[model samples]
Target: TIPHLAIDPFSLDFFDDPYPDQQTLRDAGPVVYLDKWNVYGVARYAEVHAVLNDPTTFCSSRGVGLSDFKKEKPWRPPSLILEADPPAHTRPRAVLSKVLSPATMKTIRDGFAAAADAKVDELLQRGCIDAIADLAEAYPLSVFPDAMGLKQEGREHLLPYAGLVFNAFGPPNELRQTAIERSAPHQAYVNEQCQRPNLAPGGFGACIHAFTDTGEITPDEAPLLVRSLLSAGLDETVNGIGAAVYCLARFPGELQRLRSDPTLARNAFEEAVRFESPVQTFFRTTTREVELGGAVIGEGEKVLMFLGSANRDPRRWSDPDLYDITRKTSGHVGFGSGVHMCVGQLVARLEGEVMLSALARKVAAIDIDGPVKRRFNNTLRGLESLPVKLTPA
Candidate 1:
């Protein structure tokens, strides 16, 4: 039997500061029986990577969170891409592959770059502002909705909708409830916005709809794929940006290192994703009995993988606790690994690179001006507000 730990990983205490719990979970063994959640947890990097990679056995089609779709009616529609297995996953993934490709990214590059520069220029002039609110949240909200061709009226709804979707991945706790409480018309707006005519001609949302024209996917799956993009794309980037700001502020030395080598902008963003991973735990169910770390996991068993814990595991990283821009973050499970990995990672990286680079070039120093508030999510880590004082170059 795998070692059982009586810890509640989803408790507010654990989410408040997870490193200690992460260490405990990792030290327990490669796999731990989390009886409280009635699931097996894997916190070691090697085990997490292995499970995420072998999705054929550890499937996502059932559900990717603590709540099993088979047992309960989902609060919202299931994501065609994020919650789907292959065959169903294939066409949607392929359509997205085209929509977010380097070629497509190039079309949006100058506009995104322009947006980054303008935002930083405004921040540098201000000198002091909340990094999470002013830059992280502001930057993505300003650009992504327009790129998605969303109507200007209800744009504020995107974040809440994202929060709701991610929170549902956990138990029906307060975090999930609060998200749902606030999601009212926003959820309906998200559903309505994914339709073909609502998206602009050249945006990623439109290109996804183009799949139907080419017979790549049915019109029925288009909106769900759009939903997947909107839900997965927005908050992750917002939080990723927030995580980058939080990391650089905490590790000023790393900020300086990035300033010296502006080329490290992308590295800094990637490292932030690894260090303060936006999305944390993801679940998959086994199709049949399987061996993991000398233990047999029974058929139809739920296996949870702690990406945040694995990202900081000492067994994999030399000094996992430290955030270093120069470190190679190639294999980190920040955006996850294998077939079910984040499809919109390239866009997230592009946003991070553009925003971080713009700041690295124009701002001399980034200092914390006030206390940082942790924005707790069932599966995300970010700052609600990061008051920062920047020195202009």
Candidate 2:
């Protein structure tokens, strides 16, 4: 029998803004039993990194959420990529990795940048624009789907669908229910796009089917792999890039630095991810009894890793709460660590840098003219709307 440590899993304060609670958890110890949910939590940078890096001991097979995949009905097939461990995980990852390799990404860079620039020009031409919809959403939506070999028609449903799926990773609650209700209408169409002929030729979706043909993964496994790419790739990039625009608009000096040297866009995106991690938390299940710090985590216990909290851990960063683009953030876990790290990081970076640089080259300034609201989801940190007036350069 294991002891259930008392911690509130459903407190609004925890969900509304969790940094403070995160700091408290870190200070309490490296690992704590979250009695409220009969789970374990790892808060310190060192502990969290160790758990994420050693996936063998901390298996992802239970599904990276509150409900163990073995016990409950998964909303969809487990992400063939994100949810599988080595051997089972390797082949598909390798296949998709080849398709999204550095050279392939480089080839698409100019086109993405051009699309981003054109979008900025169009939005600024209109004077006042909702930064989230006009710029942030526009850039990724413009390029990513086509890049993955899917059509953009009716793609407006991608964000909300991804949002709900990620949120459902948490315990069954009102938040999860709300997201499901909102996403129900488009669920079927979203799943349909992953099929072989459904994907546009030359897109990433097509490449996944090609992998199936090569016997790298079964035909039955291909669509789920494509869905993993679609799920992980969409909303987070949009939310993160939107946060970057909000940061730039709020900090004119930072925007000036970017305009002065376009290269600064890369650092700026990393900084935004560090400041407000779009994907806030992910879970890992312990396969063996493990000791972390002074705490012992029993086998089969789910350990929640707070990427957002670790990003701002005062023990690991100076003025951890402040946004500093010049900080050496290359080692930051904004993309997680080790083998299970985000394979599509380069894709996300390209989208962020190209769009930010394009906006820097054109907008002299951007002003917020209306109230900004935060959209709450269990897994993703996002903005609901950010109204602004773009001043053209």
Candidate 3:
């Protein structure tokens, strides 16, 4: 029998601190039936990896949330990339891959580094600041939108819009309800911003729009692809930067290591992604009957893959709980895996690397100065407030 759980993985209590329940879910079995949501769960590293790699067996087209697209209409038109399968997925993926490619990252690095240095300079001047609000959110909000070529107005809508999208992935809990209730304006703003007219010249949005002229995408599909950039880019990077700063504060010695060898900045951020897993879980629907973790999953079954748990599964890593900056975290599912691996990862890593490197060079120590506050969401893990004291190097 598949182990059955009554756990509410979407609850605020769980979001505030998920490790205990995550451990329980992982230990229970490879495949679990969470009767609370009538969905199966895979928390072990191996099982989650298998599911992500074999996307043909487990699909995203039905929806990556608990609700199946076959049963209920998506609140918005589904993501061209996030919610689509192969063939349909191939075109948009190709466009985005080329847009956010490693080569593009090199082009953006100098600009990103300059922005990061200025940010740390401001933080060092203040001496005490909320890392979440001032550093993490501030950094990406400063650079990425400009990179996307978005108009400066209505930028406040981004985080709220992202909250709405990510929370919709869970069972319709109060979090999802509140996000929807508060999201109409935010949604409208985002929709308007995605249009070609609103995009700035030479930004990523303009680049995507250009694809239509080449017939790579239709003019009708261009805005939707641009919307994908808005939806996928911001929140995860914010949380990732926040997670890295939070990790360093809690593990002060790790900060010293980052300071000693500034080159470890990328590894420092990567390890934090594995340890904290900013995007905690995503659901995939079974395309057909399949055996996974010794359980036979039938066609159309929904399986919640706990990426956060899998990243910490002891079976997959030595001392998975430790936040070691030098730890080899290559295979962590923090960004998922296989063909559907995170599309915005290069940008996210670029932001993280520069910010951490700046901090490493300019800040002597990072210490928690007050109570940390968490903003709860169904699918994303992040802090709303992190009071920190920074000593200048």
Candidate 4:
């Protein structure tokens, strides 16, 4: 018999306060059957990491969410990389891999690095700010679209559209519906921006378009691939930056540690990703009858992998709750692992490191001044409004 739990992992209650449910799910068993969603949830660090690394047995082809695409129609066109298994997943993944490579990072870094410094100076002047709206969302929105070679006029839709994309990974709940409704307000503009002619001459979108020249993907697939970049890259980085701000505000010791050695900015950002995983959960489907932690999972089963829980599992870290910039977080599941691991994580890291380093040098400290509001989502954990006061060094 499966160790089943009668819990709604997608409800507002779970999204608002997930750690308790996360612990309950983790401690239940290695593989707990969620009767609520008719899915198997693996929250333990060991098992969750295993599932992420073994996408072969736990394939993404059927759909990585609660919906089994074999039985239900997908809400929208499937992502070439996100919703595909190997072979079909290869070319696009390789194309995106090349687009977000170390060389591309270096090229994007100098400009982004300069933006980070300028952004810090602006925030330092404000003294009091909503870190999420002002810095986390602001910085990325300022740089990424232009970096992607998109026109500035209609990019506001990117945020809501991204919200819809992330929530679409879950069941069609209110959050998903709201995102759809909200995004529809500016939907045409978002779609229009993905076209090759709309894209600037020298930008990431152009880089993706060049794939058609090499037959890596068709011209038809080009805009969709560019959409995939906006979906995967932008919001994750925003929430990640928000997570770093939330972490530093809560744990001043870690903040002090970062301030002293500005070089520890990378470590600080990575630790924040581990401490408060920006991406809370993702789902994988079983390809065959597979055994995990002594339990046999049948073919076509949807398994919920709680990355947030795995990052905080005590079995993996000494004091998992504490934010420590000095901690060695090399194997953490924050950015995920193996085949479908995040393609733009390196870029996120670079952005985080650059922005944090700028903050370390200019800002003495950041303190939570007003109410810290949580922005609950099916898959992301982040702040809606984080009021903070920054002291100048």
The TM-score of predicted model 2 comes to 0.94
What is the lDDT for 216 in model 4?
Answer: 86
Q: Candidate 4 on 12-52: residue-level lDDT in tens?
A: 88878888988898888899998878899999999999999
Inter-residue clash pairs, candidate 2: 5-35, 148-203, 148-204, 149-203
What lDDT is obtained when candidate 4 is compared to the true structure? 0.87
The predictions' CA RMSDs to the true structure, in order, are 1.2, 2.1, 0.9, 1.3
Q: On a 0 to 100 scale, what is the lDDT of residue 31 in model 3?
A: 95
lDDT of 2 by residue, 222-256 (tens): 88888887778888888899889888878888888
Q: How much is 57 displaced in model 4, in angstroms?
A: 1.6
In model 4, the Cα lDDT at residue 313 comes to 94
Please provide, for model 3 over 1-393, each residue's C-alpha lDDT reduced to its tens digit, 9 standing for 90 to 100.
898999899987788779999999999999999998899999999999999998799999999999999999988899999899997998898889888989889888999999999999998999999999999999999999999998888998888888788998889988888887867898899889989889998889998998887767899999999999988878988999999999999899999999999999999999999989989999999999999978999999999999999999988999988999999899999998988899888998899999999999999999998999997889999999999999999
Greater TM-score among 2 and 4 belongs to: 4
**lDDT by candidate, in order shown:** 0.87, 0.82, 0.92, 0.87
Candidate 1, superposed: residue stretches over 4 Å from native: none
Among these predictions, the greatest TM-score belongs to 3
* Overall local distance difference test of candidate 3: 0.92
* Candidate 1 lDDT tens digits, 1-393: 689998888888888888988899998887899988789999999999999999789988889988777777778878888888898888888888888888778877788889999999998888889998889989988888887777787777788888878898887788888877857787888888999888888777787888898888889888988888778887788889988888887788988888899899998999999988888899999988999998889988899999998899888998998989989888999899998777788889989999989988898888897988888888887788889999998
